[PDB]
CSV table of C-alpha atoms in Angstrom, one decimal:
chain,number,residue,atom,x,y,z
A,1,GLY,CA,140.7,93.5,118.3
A,2,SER,CA,139.4,97.1,117.9
A,3,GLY,CA,138.7,98.7,114.6
A,4,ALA,CA,135.7,98.3,112.3
A,5,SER,CA,135.7,95.3,110.0
A,6,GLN,CA,137.2,96.0,106.6
A,7,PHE,CA,133.8,95.3,105.2
A,8,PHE,CA,132.1,98.0,107.3
A,9,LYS,CA,134.9,100.5,106.4
A,10,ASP,CA,134.7,99.8,102.7
A,11,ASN,CA,130.8,100.2,102.8
A,12,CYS,CA,131.1,103.5,104.6
A,13,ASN,CA,133.8,104.9,102.3
A,14,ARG,CA,131.7,104.5,99.2
A,15,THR,CA,129.2,107.0,100.8
A,16,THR,CA,129.2,110.7,101.9
A,17,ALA,CA,129.1,109.5,105.5
A,18,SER,CA,131.9,109.4,108.1
A,19,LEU,CA,133.4,106.4,109.8
A,20,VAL,CA,133.5,106.6,113.7
A,21,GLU,CA,135.4,103.7,115.2
A,22,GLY,CA,135.4,102.2,118.7
A,23,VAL,CA,132.7,104.4,120.2
A,24,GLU,CA,131.5,103.7,123.8
A,25,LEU,CA,127.8,104.6,124.1
A,26,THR,CA,126.7,105.5,127.6
A,27,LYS,CA,123.2,107.1,127.0
A,28,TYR,CA,120.2,105.9,125.1
A,29,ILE,CA,117.4,108.4,124.6
A,30,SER,CA,113.8,108.2,123.4
A,31,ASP,CA,112.0,111.5,122.8
A,32,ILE,CA,108.5,112.2,121.5
A,33,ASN,CA,108.5,116.0,122.0
A,34,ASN,CA,107.5,117.5,118.6
A,35,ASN,CA,110.7,119.4,117.9
A,36,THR,CA,113.2,116.8,119.1
A,37,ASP,CA,111.2,113.6,118.2
A,38,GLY,CA,113.6,110.7,117.7
A,39,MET,CA,116.0,108.0,119.1
A,40,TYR,CA,119.5,109.2,120.1
A,41,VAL,CA,122.7,107.9,121.7
A,42,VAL,CA,125.5,109.7,123.5
A,43,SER,CA,129.1,108.5,123.8
A,44,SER,CA,131.4,108.6,126.8
A,45,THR,CA,133.0,111.8,125.4
A,46,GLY,CA,129.7,113.6,124.7
A,47,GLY,CA,129.2,112.8,121.0
A,48,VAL,CA,125.5,112.8,120.1
A,49,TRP,CA,123.9,110.8,117.2
A,50,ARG,CA,120.4,110.3,115.9
A,51,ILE,CA,119.4,106.7,114.9
A,52,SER,CA,117.9,106.3,111.4
A,53,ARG,CA,114.2,105.3,111.1
A,54,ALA,CA,112.0,103.8,108.4
A,55,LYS,CA,108.4,102.7,108.3
A,56,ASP,CA,108.7,100.4,105.3
A,57,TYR,CA,110.2,97.0,104.7
A,58,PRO,CA,113.1,96.4,104.5
A,59,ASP,CA,114.6,99.4,106.2
A,60,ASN,CA,112.1,99.1,109.1
A,61,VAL,CA,114.1,95.9,110.0
A,62,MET,CA,117.6,97.4,109.8
A,63,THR,CA,116.5,100.5,111.8
A,64,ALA,CA,115.0,98.3,114.5
A,65,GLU,CA,118.3,96.4,114.7
A,66,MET,CA,120.2,99.7,115.0
A,67,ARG,CA,118.1,100.4,118.1
A,68,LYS,CA,118.8,96.9,119.5
A,69,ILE,CA,122.5,97.4,118.8
A,70,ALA,CA,122.4,100.8,120.5
A,71,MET,CA,120.7,99.5,123.6
A,72,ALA,CA,122.9,96.4,123.9
A,73,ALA,CA,126.0,98.6,123.6
A,74,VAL,CA,124.6,100.8,126.4
A,75,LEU,CA,123.7,97.9,128.7
A,76,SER,CA,126.9,95.8,128.0
A,77,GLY,CA,129.7,98.4,127.5
A,78,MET,CA,130.4,96.9,124.1
A,79,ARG,CA,131.9,99.3,121.5
A,80,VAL,CA,130.3,100.2,118.2
A,81,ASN,CA,131.5,101.5,114.9
A,82,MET,CA,129.3,103.9,113.1
A,83,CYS,CA,128.8,105.2,109.6
A,84,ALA,CA,127.4,108.7,110.3
A,85,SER,CA,126.2,111.7,108.2
A,86,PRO,CA,127.6,115.2,108.9
A,87,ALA,CA,124.6,116.9,107.2
A,88,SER,CA,122.8,117.6,110.5
A,89,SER,CA,123.1,118.3,114.2
A,90,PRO,CA,123.0,115.7,115.5
A,91,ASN,CA,124.8,113.5,113.0
A,92,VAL,CA,122.5,110.7,111.8
A,93,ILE,CA,123.7,107.0,111.9
A,94,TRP,CA,123.3,105.3,108.5
A,95,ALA,CA,125.1,102.1,109.6
A,96,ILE,CA,126.3,100.6,112.9
A,97,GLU,CA,128.5,97.7,113.8
A,98,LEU,CA,128.4,96.1,117.3
A,99,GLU,CA,131.8,94.5,118.1
A,100,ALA,CA,132.4,91.6,120.6
A,101,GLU,CA,136.0,92.3,119.5
A,102,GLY,CA,137.3,93.8,116.3
B,1,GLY,CA,129.5,70.6,115.7
B,2,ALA,CA,126.2,71.0,113.8
B,3,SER,CA,123.4,68.6,114.5
B,4,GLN,CA,123.1,65.8,111.9
B,5,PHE,CA,119.6,67.3,111.3
B,6,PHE,CA,120.9,70.7,110.3
B,7,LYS,CA,123.6,69.1,108.2
B,8,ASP,CA,121.1,66.9,106.3
B,9,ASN,CA,118.8,70.0,105.8
B,10,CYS,CA,121.7,72.0,104.3
B,11,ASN,CA,122.8,69.1,102.0
B,12,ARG,CA,119.4,69.1,100.2
B,13,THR,CA,120.2,72.6,98.8
B,14,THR,CA,123.0,74.1,96.8
B,15,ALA,CA,124.4,75.8,99.9
B,16,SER,CA,127.5,74.9,101.8
B,17,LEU,CA,127.7,74.2,105.6
B,18,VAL,CA,130.0,76.3,107.8
B,19,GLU,CA,130.7,74.9,111.2
B,20,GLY,CA,131.9,76.3,114.5
B,21,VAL,CA,131.8,79.9,113.4
B,22,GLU,CA,132.5,82.5,116.1
B,23,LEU,CA,130.7,85.7,115.1
B,24,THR,CA,132.3,88.9,116.4
B,25,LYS,CA,130.5,91.7,114.5
B,26,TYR,CA,126.8,92.5,113.9
B,27,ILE,CA,126.0,95.2,111.3
B,28,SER,CA,122.9,97.0,110.3
B,29,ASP,CA,123.3,99.2,107.2
B,30,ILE,CA,120.7,101.3,105.3
B,31,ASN,CA,123.2,102.7,102.8
B,32,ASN,CA,121.7,102.5,99.3
B,33,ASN,CA,124.1,99.9,97.9
B,34,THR,CA,124.9,97.9,101.1
B,35,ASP,CA,121.3,97.8,102.5
B,36,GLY,CA,121.0,94.8,104.9
B,37,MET,CA,121.9,92.9,108.0
B,38,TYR,CA,125.3,91.3,108.1
B,39,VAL,CA,127.7,89.4,110.4
B,40,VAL,CA,131.4,89.0,110.5
B,41,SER,CA,133.4,86.1,112.0
B,42,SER,CA,136.5,86.1,114.1
B,43,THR,CA,138.5,85.4,110.8
B,44,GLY,CA,136.9,88.2,108.8
B,45,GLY,CA,134.3,86.0,106.9
B,46,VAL,CA,131.2,88.1,106.1
B,47,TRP,CA,127.6,87.0,105.6
B,48,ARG,CA,124.3,88.7,104.9
B,49,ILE,CA,121.2,87.6,106.9
B,50,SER,CA,118.3,86.4,104.8
B,51,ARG,CA,115.3,88.7,105.1
B,52,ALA,CA,111.6,88.1,104.1
B,53,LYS,CA,108.6,90.4,104.4
B,54,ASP,CA,105.7,87.9,104.6
B,55,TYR,CA,104.5,85.1,106.8
B,56,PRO,CA,106.0,82.6,107.6
B,57,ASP,CA,109.6,83.6,106.7
B,58,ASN,CA,109.3,86.9,108.5
B,59,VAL,CA,109.4,84.8,111.6
B,60,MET,CA,112.4,82.7,110.6
B,61,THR,CA,114.4,85.7,109.5
B,62,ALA,CA,113.6,87.6,112.7
B,63,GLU,CA,114.9,84.6,114.6
B,64,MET,CA,118.1,84.6,112.5
B,65,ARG,CA,118.6,88.2,113.6
B,66,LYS,CA,118.1,87.2,117.2
B,67,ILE,CA,120.5,84.3,116.9
B,68,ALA,CA,123.2,86.5,115.3
B,69,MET,CA,123.0,89.1,118.0
B,70,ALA,CA,123.0,86.5,120.8
B,71,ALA,CA,126.1,84.9,119.2
B,72,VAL,CA,128.0,88.3,119.0
B,73,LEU,CA,126.9,89.3,122.6
B,74,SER,CA,127.8,86.0,124.2
B,75,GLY,CA,130.5,84.5,122.0
B,76,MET,CA,128.4,81.4,121.4
B,77,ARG,CA,129.2,79.5,118.2
B,78,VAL,CA,126.9,79.0,115.2
B,79,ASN,CA,126.6,76.7,112.3
B,80,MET,CA,125.5,78.1,109.0
B,81,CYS,CA,123.9,77.0,105.8
B,82,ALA,CA,125.2,79.7,103.4
B,83,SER,CA,125.0,80.2,99.6
B,84,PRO,CA,128.4,80.4,97.9
B,85,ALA,CA,127.2,82.2,94.7
B,86,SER,CA,126.6,85.6,96.4
B,87,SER,CA,129.1,87.8,98.1
B,88,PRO,CA,128.7,88.4,100.9
B,89,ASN,CA,127.3,84.8,101.2
B,90,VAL,CA,123.6,84.6,102.3
B,91,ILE,CA,122.6,82.8,105.4
B,92,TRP,CA,119.7,80.4,104.5
B,93,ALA,CA,119.8,78.6,107.9
B,94,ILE,CA,121.6,79.0,111.2
B,95,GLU,CA,122.1,76.9,114.3
B,96,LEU,CA,122.9,78.5,117.7
B,97,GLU,CA,124.9,76.2,120.0
B,98,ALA,CA,124.6,76.6,123.8
B,99,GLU,CA,127.7,77.4,125.7
B,100,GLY,CA,129.4,74.1,126.7
B,101,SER,CA,127.6,71.9,124.2
B,102,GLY,CA,129.1,69.8,121.4
B,103,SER,CA,130.9,72.0,118.6
C,1,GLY,CA,109.6,69.1,136.5
C,2,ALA,CA,106.3,69.9,134.9
C,3,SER,CA,103.5,71.8,136.7
C,4,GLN,CA,100.5,69.5,137.4
C,5,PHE,CA,98.6,72.0,135.2
C,6,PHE,CA,100.9,71.6,132.3
C,7,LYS,CA,100.8,67.8,132.7
C,8,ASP,CA,97.0,67.6,132.9
C,9,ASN,CA,96.7,69.9,129.8
C,10,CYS,CA,99.1,67.7,127.8
C,11,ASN,CA,97.2,64.5,129.0
C,12,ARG,CA,94.0,65.9,127.4
C,13,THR,CA,95.6,65.5,123.9
C,14,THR,CA,97.1,62.8,121.7
C,15,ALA,CA,100.4,64.5,122.3
C,16,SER,CA,103.4,63.4,124.4
C,17,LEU,CA,104.8,65.0,127.5
C,18,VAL,CA,108.6,65.5,127.5
C,19,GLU,CA,109.9,66.6,130.9
C,20,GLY,CA,113.1,68.2,132.1
C,21,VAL,CA,114.6,68.9,128.7
C,22,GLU,CA,117.8,70.8,128.2
C,23,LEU,CA,117.7,72.5,124.8
C,24,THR,CA,121.2,73.0,123.4
C,25,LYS,CA,120.5,74.1,119.8
C,26,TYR,CA,118.2,76.6,118.2
C,27,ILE,CA,117.7,76.5,114.4
C,28,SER,CA,116.2,79.0,112.0
C,29,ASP,CA,115.8,77.7,108.4
C,30,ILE,CA,114.2,79.3,105.3
C,31,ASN,CA,115.1,76.6,102.8
C,32,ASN,CA,111.8,75.6,101.3
C,33,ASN,CA,111.9,71.9,102.0
C,34,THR,CA,112.8,72.3,105.8
C,35,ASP,CA,111.3,75.8,106.3
C,36,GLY,CA,110.8,76.4,110.1
C,37,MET,CA,112.0,76.9,113.7
C,38,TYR,CA,113.5,73.9,115.5
C,39,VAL,CA,115.2,73.0,118.8
C,40,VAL,CA,117.6,70.2,119.6
C,41,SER,CA,117.9,68.7,123.2
C,42,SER,CA,121.1,67.4,124.8
C,43,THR,CA,119.9,63.9,124.0
C,44,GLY,CA,119.9,64.7,120.3
C,45,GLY,CA,116.1,64.9,120.0
C,46,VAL,CA,114.7,67.4,117.4
C,47,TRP,CA,111.4,69.3,117.6
C,48,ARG,CA,109.6,71.8,115.4
C,49,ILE,CA,108.1,74.9,117.0
C,50,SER,CA,104.5,75.6,116.0
C,51,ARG,CA,103.7,78.7,113.9
C,52,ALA,CA,100.5,80.7,113.5
C,53,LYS,CA,99.8,83.7,111.3
C,54,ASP,CA,96.6,85.0,113.0
C,55,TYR,CA,95.6,86.2,116.4
C,56,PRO,CA,95.7,84.9,119.0
C,57,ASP,CA,98.0,81.9,118.2
C,58,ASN,CA,100.6,84.3,116.7
C,59,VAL,CA,101.1,85.5,120.3
C,60,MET,CA,101.6,82.0,121.8
C,61,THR,CA,103.9,80.9,119.0
C,62,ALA,CA,106.0,84.1,119.4
C,63,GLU,CA,106.3,83.2,123.1
C,64,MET,CA,107.3,79.5,122.3
C,65,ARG,CA,110.2,81.0,120.3
C,66,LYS,CA,111.3,83.3,123.2
C,67,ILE,CA,111.1,80.4,125.6
C,68,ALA,CA,113.2,78.3,123.2
C,69,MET,CA,116.0,80.9,122.9
C,70,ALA,CA,115.9,81.7,126.6
C,71,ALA,CA,116.4,78.0,127.4
C,72,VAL,CA,119.3,77.6,124.9
C,73,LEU,CA,121.0,80.8,126.2
C,74,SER,CA,120.6,80.0,129.9
C,75,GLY,CA,120.5,76.2,130.2
C,76,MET,CA,117.0,76.5,131.9
C,77,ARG,CA,114.9,73.3,131.5
C,78,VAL,CA,111.6,73.1,129.5
C,79,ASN,CA,108.7,70.7,129.6
C,80,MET,CA,107.1,70.1,126.2
C,81,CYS,CA,103.8,68.8,124.8
C,82,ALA,CA,104.7,67.5,121.4
C,83,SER,CA,102.7,65.6,118.8
C,84,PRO,CA,104.2,62.3,117.3
C,85,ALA,CA,102.1,62.6,114.1
C,86,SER,CA,105.2,64.0,112.3
C,87,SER,CA,109.0,64.0,112.6
C,88,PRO,CA,110.4,66.3,113.9
C,89,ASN,CA,107.6,66.3,116.5
C,90,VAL,CA,105.6,69.6,116.6
C,91,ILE,CA,105.6,71.5,120.0
C,92,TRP,CA,101.9,72.3,120.8
C,93,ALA,CA,102.8,73.6,124.3
C,94,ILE,CA,106.0,74.5,126.3
C,95,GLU,CA,106.8,75.4,129.9
C,96,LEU,CA,110.0,77.3,130.9
C,97,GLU,CA,111.3,76.4,134.5
C,98,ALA,CA,113.1,78.9,136.7
C,99,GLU,CA,116.6,77.8,137.7
C,100,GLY,CA,116.6,75.8,140.9
C,101,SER,CA,112.8,75.5,140.8
C,102,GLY,CA,112.5,71.7,141.4
C,103,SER,CA,113.0,69.2,138.7
D,1,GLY,CA,109.2,97.8,147.8
D,2,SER,CA,108.5,95.5,150.7
D,3,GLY,CA,105.2,95.0,148.9
D,4,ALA,CA,103.1,96.3,146.0
D,5,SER,CA,103.3,100.1,145.4
D,6,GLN,CA,100.4,102.0,147.0
D,7,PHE,CA,99.5,103.0,143.4
D,8,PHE,CA,99.2,99.4,142.2
D,9,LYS,CA,97.1,98.5,145.3
D,10,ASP,CA,94.8,101.5,145.1
D,11,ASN,CA,94.2,100.7,141.4
D,12,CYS,CA,93.4,97.0,142.1
D,13,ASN,CA,91.1,97.7,145.0
D,14,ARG,CA,88.7,99.7,142.8
D,15,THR,CA,88.0,96.6,140.6
D,16,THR,CA,86.4,93.2,141.2
D,17,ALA,CA,89.8,91.6,140.9
D,18,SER,CA,92.0,90.7,143.8
D,19,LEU,CA,95.5,91.6,144.8
D,20,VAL,CA,98.2,89.0,145.0
D,21,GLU,CA,101.5,90.3,146.4
D,22,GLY,CA,105.1,89.2,146.4
D,23,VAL,CA,104.6,86.2,144.0
D,24,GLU,CA,107.6,84.2,142.8
D,25,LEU,CA,106.8,83.0,139.2
D,26,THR,CA,108.6,79.7,138.5
D,27,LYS,CA,107.0,78.5,135.2
D,28,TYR,CA,106.0,80.3,132.0
D,29,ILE,CA,103.7,78.4,129.7
D,30,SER,CA,102.7,78.8,126.0
D,31,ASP,CA,99.9,76.5,124.8
D,32,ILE,CA,98.0,76.3,121.5
D,33,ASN,CA,96.0,73.1,122.3
D,34,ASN,CA,92.4,73.6,121.4
D,35,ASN,CA,90.8,74.0,124.9
D,36,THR,CA,93.9,75.2,126.8
D,37,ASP,CA,95.0,77.8,124.3
D,38,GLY,CA,96.7,80.6,126.2
D,39,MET,CA,99.7,82.1,128.0
D,40,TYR,CA,100.0,81.1,131.7
D,41,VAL,CA,102.3,81.5,134.7
D,42,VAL,CA,102.7,79.2,137.7
D,43,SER,CA,104.0,80.4,141.1
D,44,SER,CA,106.2,78.6,143.6
D,45,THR,CA,103.0,77.7,145.5
D,46,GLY,CA,101.4,76.0,142.5
D,47,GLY,CA,99.0,78.9,141.7
D,48,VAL,CA,98.2,79.2,138.0
D,49,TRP,CA,97.2,82.4,136.2
D,50,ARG,CA,96.3,83.2,132.6
D,51,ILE,CA,97.8,86.4,131.0
D,52,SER,CA,95.3,88.7,129.3
D,53,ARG,CA,95.5,89.1,125.5
D,54,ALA,CA,94.1,91.9,123.3
D,55,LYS,CA,94.2,92.3,119.5
D,56,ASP,CA,93.5,96.0,119.2
D,57,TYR,CA,95.4,99.1,120.3
D,58,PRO,CA,96.1,100.1,123.0
D,59,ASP,CA,95.7,96.9,125.0
D,60,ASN,CA,97.9,94.9,122.5
D,61,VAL,CA,100.7,97.0,124.0
D,62,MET,CA,99.8,96.4,127.7
D,63,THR,CA,99.3,92.7,127.2
D,64,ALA,CA,102.6,92.4,125.3
D,65,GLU,CA,104.3,94.0,128.3
D,66,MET,CA,102.5,91.6,130.7
D,67,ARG,CA,104.2,88.7,128.8
D,68,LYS,CA,107.6,90.4,129.0
D,69,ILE,CA,107.1,91.0,132.7
D,70,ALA,CA,106.1,87.4,133.3
D,71,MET,CA,109.1,85.9,131.4
D,72,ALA,CA,111.5,88.4,133.1
D,73,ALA,CA,110.1,87.3,136.5
D,74,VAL,CA,110.7,83.7,135.6
D,75,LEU,CA,114.3,84.3,134.3
D,76,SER,CA,115.3,86.7,137.1
D,77,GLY,CA,113.2,85.5,140.0
D,78,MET,CA,112.1,89.1,140.6
D,79,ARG,CA,108.7,89.0,142.4
D,80,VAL,CA,105.5,90.3,140.9
D,81,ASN,CA,102.3,91.7,142.3
D,82,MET,CA,99.2,90.8,140.3
D,83,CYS,CA,95.7,92.1,140.1
D,84,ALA,CA,93.7,89.0,139.1
D,85,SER,CA,90.1,88.2,138.3
D,86,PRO,CA,88.4,85.1,139.8
D,87,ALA,CA,85.6,85.1,137.2
D,88,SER,CA,87.6,82.4,135.4
D,89,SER,CA,89.9,79.6,136.3
D,90,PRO,CA,92.9,80.0,136.0
D,91,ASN,CA,92.4,83.6,137.2
D,92,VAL,CA,93.1,86.2,134.6
D,93,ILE,CA,95.8,88.8,135.2
D,94,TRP,CA,94.3,92.3,134.7
D,95,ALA,CA,97.4,94.1,136.0
D,96,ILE,CA,101.0,93.1,136.9
D,97,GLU,CA,103.8,94.9,138.7
D,98,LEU,CA,107.4,93.7,138.3
D,99,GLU,CA,109.3,94.8,141.5
D,100,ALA,CA,113.0,94.9,142.3
D,101,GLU,CA,113.9,93.2,145.7
D,102,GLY,CA,113.9,95.4,148.7
E,1,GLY,CA,123.3,113.4,135.4
E,2,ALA,CA,121.4,114.0,132.2
E,3,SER,CA,123.4,114.9,129.1
E,4,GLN,CA,123.4,118.5,128.1
E,5,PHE,CA,121.6,117.4,124.9
E,6,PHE,CA,118.8,115.8,126.9
E,7,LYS,CA,118.5,118.9,129.2
E,8,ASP,CA,118.3,121.4,126.3
E,9,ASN,CA,115.7,119.2,124.6
E,10,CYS,CA,113.6,119.2,127.8
E,11,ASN,CA,114.0,123.0,128.4
E,12,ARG,CA,112.2,123.7,125.0
E,13,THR,CA,109.0,122.1,126.4
E,14,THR,CA,106.6,122.7,129.3
E,15,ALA,CA,107.8,119.5,131.0
E,16,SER,CA,110.3,119.3,133.8
E,17,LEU,CA,113.6,117.4,133.9
E,18,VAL,CA,113.9,114.6,136.6
E,19,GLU,CA,117.5,113.4,137.0
E,20,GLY,CA,119.0,110.2,138.3
E,21,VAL,CA,115.9,108.2,139.0
E,22,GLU,CA,116.0,104.7,140.3
E,23,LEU,CA,113.1,102.7,138.9
E,24,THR,CA,112.1,99.8,141.1
E,25,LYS,CA,108.7,98.8,139.6
E,26,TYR,CA,107.2,98.4,136.2
E,27,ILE,CA,103.4,98.1,135.7
E,28,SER,CA,101.2,96.9,132.9
E,29,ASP,CA,97.5,97.5,133.7
E,30,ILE,CA,94.4,96.9,131.5
E,31,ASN,CA,91.8,97.6,134.2
E,32,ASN,CA,89.2,99.9,132.6
E,33,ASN,CA,89.9,102.8,134.9
E,34,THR,CA,93.7,102.7,135.0
E,35,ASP,CA,94.6,101.1,131.7
E,36,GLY,CA,98.3,102.0,130.9
E,37,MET,CA,102.0,101.4,131.4
E,38,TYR,CA,103.6,102.9,134.5
E,39,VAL,CA,106.9,102.9,136.4
E,40,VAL,CA,107.6,103.5,140.1
E,41,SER,CA,110.8,105.0,141.5
E,42,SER,CA,112.6,104.0,144.7
E,43,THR,CA,111.1,107.1,146.3
E,44,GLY,CA,107.5,106.1,145.3
E,45,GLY,CA,107.2,108.5,142.3
E,46,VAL,CA,104.8,107.2,139.6
E,47,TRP,CA,105.0,108.0,135.9
E,48,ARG,CA,102.9,107.0,132.9
E,49,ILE,CA,104.8,106.0,129.8
E,50,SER,CA,103.6,107.6,126.5
E,51,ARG,CA,102.2,105.5,123.8
E,52,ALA,CA,101.3,106.0,120.1
E,53,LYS,CA,99.7,103.8,117.5
E,54,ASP,CA,101.4,105.1,114.4
E,55,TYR,CA,104.8,105.8,112.9
E,56,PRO,CA,107.1,107.2,114.0
E,57,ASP,CA,106.2,107.6,117.6
E,58,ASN,CA,105.2,103.9,117.9
E,59,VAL,CA,108.9,103.3,117.6
E,60,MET,CA,109.9,105.9,120.3
E,61,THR,CA,107.2,104.7,122.7
E,62,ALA,CA,108.2,101.1,122.3
E,63,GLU,CA,111.8,102.1,123.2
E,64,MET,CA,110.6,104.0,126.3
E,65,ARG,CA,109.0,100.7,127.4
E,66,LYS,CA,112.3,98.8,126.7
E,67,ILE,CA,114.3,101.5,128.6
E,68,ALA,CA,111.8,101.2,131.5
E,69,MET,CA,112.1,97.5,131.8
E,70,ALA,CA,115.9,97.5,131.5
E,71,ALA,CA,116.1,100.1,134.3
E,72,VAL,CA,113.9,98.1,136.7
E,73,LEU,CA,115.7,94.8,135.8
E,74,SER,CA,119.2,96.0,136.0
E,75,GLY,CA,119.0,99.1,138.3
E,76,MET,CA,120.6,101.4,135.7
E,77,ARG,CA,119.3,104.9,136.4
E,78,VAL,CA,117.3,107.2,134.1
E,79,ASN,CA,116.8,110.9,133.4
E,80,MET,CA,113.2,111.9,132.4
E,81,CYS,CA,111.4,114.8,130.8
E,82,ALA,CA,108.0,114.5,132.5
E,83,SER,CA,104.9,116.6,132.0
E,84,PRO,CA,103.0,117.6,135.2
E,85,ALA,CA,99.7,118.3,133.3
E,86,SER,CA,98.4,114.8,133.9
E,87,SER,CA,98.3,112.5,137.0
E,88,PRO,CA,100.4,110.4,137.0
E,89,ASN,CA,102.9,112.5,135.3
E,90,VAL,CA,103.6,111.5,131.7
E,91,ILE,CA,107.1,110.7,130.3
E,92,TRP,CA,107.7,112.6,127.0
E,93,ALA,CA,111.5,111.7,126.9
E,94,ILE,CA,113.8,109.3,128.7
E,95,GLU,CA,117.5,108.8,128.9
E,96,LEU,CA,119.0,105.4,129.9
E,97,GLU,CA,122.4,105.7,131.7
E,98,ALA,CA,125.0,102.9,131.4
E,99,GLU,CA,126.2,101.2,134.5
E,100,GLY,CA,129.5,102.8,135.7
E,101,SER,CA,129.1,105.8,133.4
E,102,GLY,CA,128.4,108.0,136.3
E,103,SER,CA,125.7,110.7,136.7
């Protein structure tokens, strides 16, 4: 139906992060070079994001699911909604929503 | 619909049974106040996925996550045992139904 | 149906061979009375997947779960070695069959 | 790859294991019964192999990938090439190559 | 082609960019001389996938393995940042391109 769930929006708006709706991810990147170490995605229009990571339970779970959502979007063409931080370049994903429809 | 087995299992607890749910969104959030894994149905119902750190529930909760994603990716229906006290309601058990099975 | 190897392995045990099974439900449940992973076949039969915390059976039981979901998602048939000592019967071994690979 | 990559063949041929090429895996088996405890694969010809396992890094990674390769071959009917030891029965897979058709 | 982000990241290292690679083979090997994970391209190129025991690179290396498999399985193409200091060349970064998203 397009558009993040109201739940997802409400959650994002109570933070400093920015809602990004209806993104098509077309690249998934793994990098271990010491300066650019991380997991990233790139959208059809060139937007770049870094995926959050955590070693500890329970965020080690959510961040692993963020990766699975990112890769499934890339393989499937499914769109995502993102709650993303403007602190850095690239912006960091703090929440992500995979949509069958909206 | 849900297997009798899954219905009976839910009925032993304080939770309620939700049947034939079509999940359309799968959310991962690490924001400090909404930290969790969540799903949203085609009608806007929201649920949190149980989590657990230690054996053996770490297995069961991982499988709930896999079931939820599969549901969203394929449009397969699920049946849920969910606590009504919490909002969003917590999934205590979940049943994935194969495409073209019973409902 | 079942490889001769799988059959022969099952026949070495007190367990029962179940051949040609279409799994149509996959259940994850963390309620404490019915804690576990289960599958339901198109005939309505219910089985519990084995679990193990330690190496190496933690590998095999992980793989049983992957076989179970793969079967539910795809309609591929499984053969099971299941113990009738409890209900639901516990899967001690499982074999996933490629589509159009015999019976 | 109308066959195993020259790399995979060269690597196998320096060991005591033997090369099995172009195999169609039709069954994937998980077993925790006391004397047949293991992961196995069965080919369209009735050949049975045991997948290696390892508890420690780095071979926990390689054996985990062996299992992914084996299931993916069974689901997809993509063929595999195996480097397998005859020191046991079933023969133990020491290396495996998933190959796209062609 | 690779994203500009990916290219700029590769240009700050000693490695070289390889663009638009079709991976046709995925190898897991525990033989004592050639122990590793490798991929092979449609042209016969061989690369070794990086690995790492500990956080955070155990995440990134696990994802390289997932990207590799998904490429071979589905024929989606990859861009790679590969060091020529070893033989086979080692992958230090990899970019998975969506089907129908062009070069």
